[model samples]
Target chain A: RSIIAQDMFKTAFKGFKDGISAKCPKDTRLYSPDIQEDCLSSALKCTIAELKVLEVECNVTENDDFMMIYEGLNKEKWNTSSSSPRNCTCELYNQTHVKEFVENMERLVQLLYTR
Target chain B: RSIIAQDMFKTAFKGFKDGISAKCPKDTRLYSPDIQEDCLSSALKCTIAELKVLEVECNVTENDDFMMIYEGLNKEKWNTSSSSPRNCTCELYNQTHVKEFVENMERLVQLLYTR
Candidate 1:
């Protein structure tokens, strides 16, 4: 078997701290460069899924700029398993967490852009 | 009848100048407050549609932060006719125009947020 994968779908700020048992690394920078991309891929894949759910469940459409970035990030290659993102899951209980997750992902997107 | 609605779906930079006869106001700021909002409303409605088309037609995804702001601005009340957005259309010949439009809209979103 391969080296174990970190849980990237979990929320580092709130979700895992509360309702969720899973947690992403507090800072992916600590991980190796390859692992960092994997972490981002996992987080992004799960984060976008949450946004889609928010559209119907929360009855609020997300901002288009964020959607564009998400769409862009989704196209890139990162994870070992291209199917991993679909297999991931994340749940944010409040708008604060949602905003936090978005902010985190936005920073990571730019981070990847520089590489 | 009534005052004629300015064409917002037409690209102010290139599309209207080249392939299209329609054009948005060179500067919506010159218009009265109500008209400015209407101009913005029209531009936003059409700009968003162009973005969607890009996703499929161009086979490219945009940045997520820009999408968020677009989503925020889209929810705003600007035009006299909420139906106007659906009635509008815009086109861009190059990526320069796309980036220009995004920068303009991002500024407008912040401007509207201040009001």
Candidate 2:
């Protein structure tokens, strides 16, 4: 069957990418540790929280298929602890992670189109 | 200083609640497993994705103070695998988790104002 809520997914992923562009620096290593921390957390949290809230608002839990797809993309569990991503540091946040997350989200949008 | 982007947070949150209202039902247990999964994933993903995009677009990562406050609210880390909330089930998806996540986000919005 065709993906469900394709338009919503498109808007979401685009907005996510735009947010990444606005927040993350091209070269994160250049900045001071404090600044780097700020940049990394803000950028990464924005992406994570965005996905969390979207899951809540869109009621994605209802769909087993979408849930599986989402789980396949993310490592953390959403329901266990509202206060999640307990460990965050500049070392953990970098261009590579950012790129992967954003691409995965885009892939999710695509997933919506196909399955 | 006052909250950096109070208006943006406000707008982001309101839209989230509205999305929740539109997608979620008062009684989730009533629905069959398949239907329940659809509803839960749609609603939850909507909320999560909305927050994720707003973070990106607004560059919440740029601000360290905000990062601390956000981390205080969510348990999962945004920087990890793109596919997150890996473990989600109907038993986990309920009004309580939904209420807490939304409230915490609202609290985060409020946090922007004071600290």
Q: In terms of lDDT, which candidate is strongest?
A: 2
Candidate 1 residue runs with Cα over 4 Å from true position: A1-38, A59-63, A77-96, B1-115
Q: TM-score per model for chain B alone?
A: 0.40, 0.33
Worst 10 residues of 2 chain A by lDDT: A29-38
What is the Å distance of residue A58 in model 1 from its true position? 3.8
**Tens digits of per-residue lDDT for model 2, A1-115:** 3334455555555655555533444432110111111122333344445445445544444444445435543553222223332223322221122333455445433532342
lDDT of 1 at B24: 27
Which candidate gets the maximum DockQ versus the true structure? 2
Compared with the true structure, what per-residue lDDT tens digits does model 1 show for residues A53-102? 43443322343443454455566554343222222123211112333444
Q: How many angstroms is residue B13 displaced in model 1 relative to the true structure, after the best TM-score fit?
A: 58
Q: Fnat of each prediction?
A: 0.00, 0.00
Candidate 2: which stretches are off by over 4 Å? A1-115, B2-4, B25-100
Model 2, span B2-114: residue lDDT tens: 34456555655565545452343433211011111112233234345444534543424454444443443354322222234232332222122232345444653353334
